[model samples]
Target: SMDKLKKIDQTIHAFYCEKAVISEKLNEAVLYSINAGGKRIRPILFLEVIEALQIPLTESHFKAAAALEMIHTGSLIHDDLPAMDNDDYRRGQLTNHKKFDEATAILAGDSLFLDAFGMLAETDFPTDVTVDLVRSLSSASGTFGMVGGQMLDMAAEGKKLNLKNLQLIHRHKTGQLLAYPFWAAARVAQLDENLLATFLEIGMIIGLAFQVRDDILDITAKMTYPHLLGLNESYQILDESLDQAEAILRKLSDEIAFAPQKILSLIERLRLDA
Candidate 1:
């Protein structure tokens, strides 16, 4: 079942390569980095939440998963642009802007983000559920979340940040989007208030942990917790997050109708800085 989560990637690849687009430059610009490979973590994590609950996959689920990847890839494309990270590489390959022109790369990002909306709009879920999902995604991707985080991130590039402000940057920048997928899936499953709250909290924790781990791995990260907190403390914080996340999921397994092992397995998957 965990392995099957990857089926979404194949499906979305086909959707992009076979079912959509014609311009080679644009197609390559979009598909190049995407095909180069990524963890595809976002979509799988969303599906994992539902799979743990033993929910059957639907067209809407597939579309939602695809939308997640599109949105993520769009951000990646934009992030690597001449104006953003300004790098020549991504996933160990040439970045989109480096491969093509800046103009092509920018359009590729726009189309990917727009296309995610299109995919979400096309999902077979009830209009209300899709509406909620779209709202959650937009909120996470917009001025309140990732975009705002990036703006602040740029502002903080050369400045030293204390713990409180650092958390704020990561929370808005990274945690919000990560939270969106989990809570959105909870809503898709029509989980109860208690279950919803649990899932939301778990997602937020893992989201922050995910960023911390990034900071740890890519020590070059500008706003990593370790930079301010020290490496030993970073490890401790990550371990604490992992333990807490697992405890919640373990409790959830005992209380809910979901697959316990599958849900609990995620703790092994997400650590704050390990």
Candidate 2:
């Protein structure tokens, strides 16, 4: 079933490429970066949740999944710009601003973002569910979430960050967006508020662990994180966050009706490998 789903995902990606057309060269440049191969993790997460819930693979679910991916792509394009991380490579290729121009990259990011909203609005889900999904996604990507976290990260660059500050950055920058699939699926499935809250907590833990692992990797391979925090402390932070994530999963196991085992298995793999 997962294989079949993966095939469908590939098809959807191809469809996205065909449908996502822009008039300007700048938009095309940004789109080219997004078209470079990625794991498409966020969209797959949404689809996995829907599958776990045993929902019919409706058009709405497909659109919602695609929309999530669009938002993620937009963020990555912006994140690689000189004003942000100024990365020269992404997904193992030249960054958008490198392949194109800086202004093109910026405009490309803007176009992808607007397209994401358009995708959401055109989905076939119920009005209430669509509203909730849109609200959740927007909040996750907005001033109080991903954008806010990025701002803090930029501000905190080259500065020593306390644990609380680290938590705030990880929670908003990565956690909020990562939390969206579960929250969106819960709303789509009409799950109760308590379960939604639990999922949110679970998302936060996973997000924190993910960021810590990223830091660890950067420290080990790139000497990036270690440049800020020493290698030993970076490793310590990663281990602690992973432990916290596992604890949350254990607590929420009985409460989650769908995708619990799958999500837990993924977490286990990530933790063990880390």
Candidate 3:
């Protein structure tokens, strides 16, 4: 099922490539980065939430999922820039800048950023729902969310940070975008206001949990939960968040007829060794 969802996302990107302007190299660069074998986790999470909510899949769902991925992929491209991580490779292949050039990679990222919103704007969702999605996504992707966290992360590079400051970085840096799937699904499914708030809360906790797990895996990272809190405490924190998230999902299941199994399984998958 995951593979099928990922394939659909790739197809969506390919279709966009076909329709892009005849400026072949730019489109090629955009397509190249998008197809660079990422796990497509963010968009798959978005689609999984929609399915778990028992919503019928449609073009709108696919469009929204792809848009989420485009935003994430764009961020990764920039993150590998000479000024950022200065990474020459990602996912076992040459990074965008290395594969193409610095300027091309930068433009590819910018194009993905712009086209993500454009795709969202073109979704078949109602005007209000579309507005809500745009608002939520932009807030997650912009200065207050991922970019702001990236700034803090860069500044903290090769430096020590206390636990609070470390979490502040991860919550905005990783948590915001991760929160999108649940909140976006809640909105798209047109859940009640109270339920929507609960969904958002669940997403935030799950986001933090995912980052903590990541810290456990990526030991090379200079600043991480494990580095600050110690490995044992970090593992404990990850379990605590996962437990809390699943508990919330269980509670929400009673309020709605949708299956919590799907969401819970995905949550469990956040653990590296799971």
Candidate 4:
């Protein structure tokens, strides 16, 4: 697992390092946020899917993995801005906006968002595959997904959201991106539409499970499963999501001889006590 994460970190650094030196500070801030401490779960999940399916790894897949992390890092940089979450720190490191100026942070995020597609385009996949990857990423990163969720979340601030509304917000804000890794791996592996759809469904289930566990760890969030339901009720929901995912994974295992232990290990991290 650490080896997988190291590969992702190296690819990410290589992408930025190989780029032309534009503004020194912009590069610094971007690298800083990219290097911020986290498990790099999103990209790791992408690689895990490829490994579980016994697909031969390719350069394009690593590029795609790095791009996934880039979008996620970019979103965090923007999310931590003064006008957004206004967070001073993330993962025990000062946020980009706090460490640098807000303008620099905004530019760093903007650069990341724009550069990620360029990174994707540089991948060795076929043109159609590349286009699909870009399309998948854009939809998840844009108004159709993460940004859309952010809007709803921000709007609901200073107010407690109802369960249904909260779910909607999470589905968009957190679920879409979480679901993306599976779809990305499927596309890169050139899976048929039916299996691709199934992968997406699994992704969403894991996404829901992840968010529920997140809420379980920090019930202080104004809008969370534990807040909407009680702690026990929230745990039930988490169990339900994981149960659904495990069933589907077992089915896939029987069909494709897919071993999803790595995927399961990734999901295990989302559990509070695991």
Best by TM-score: 4
Error of 4 at 176 (Å): 0.5
Task: Give residue 49's error in model 3 in angstroms.
Answer: 1.5
lDDT of 1 by residue, 1-274 (tens): 4354467766666667766557777766777766778877778778878777888877678779878888888888888887888989886788888888899989998888887888888887889989988998999888998889888888888888899889888888888878777888899998888878888898888887888787787874456777799988888888888788878888877887767576566667665433
lDDT of 2 by residue, 1-274 (tens): 4453455345445544666554658546755865677776677667766777767677667778878877788889999999888999986799888988898889878877887877787777879888888888889998998889889888777677666777788788888888787678767888889977866776676676677677766545622344457767666766676677567656655456554566656666665243
- Model 2's TM-score against the true structure: 0.84
- For candidate 3, which ten residues in a row score worst on lDDT? 1-10
Alpha-carbon runs more than 4 Å astray in model 1: 1-6, 17-22, 270-274
Error of 4 at 174 (Å): 0.9
Candidate No. with top lDDT: 4
lDDT of 3 by residue, 176-263 (tens): 9989978998899998999889988988998899898888988744688877878888888999999999998888778786787877
List candidate 4 segments past 4 Å from native. none
The all-Cα superposition gives candidate 2 an RMSD in Å to the true structure of: 3.2
Candidate 2 CA-lDDT value: 0.73
**Model 4 error, position 137 (Å):** 1.0
Give the whole-model CA lDDT for all candidates, comma-separated.
0.80, 0.73, 0.85, 0.86
List the pairs of residues colliding in candidate 4.
Answer: none
Question: Clashes in candidate 1: how many?
Answer: 0
- Candidate 3, residue 57: Cα displacement in angstroms equals 0.6
Per-residue CA lDDT of model 4 for 133-239, tens digit only, reads 99989999899899999999898887877888988989989899899999888888788999999999999998888888888987543787877888888888888
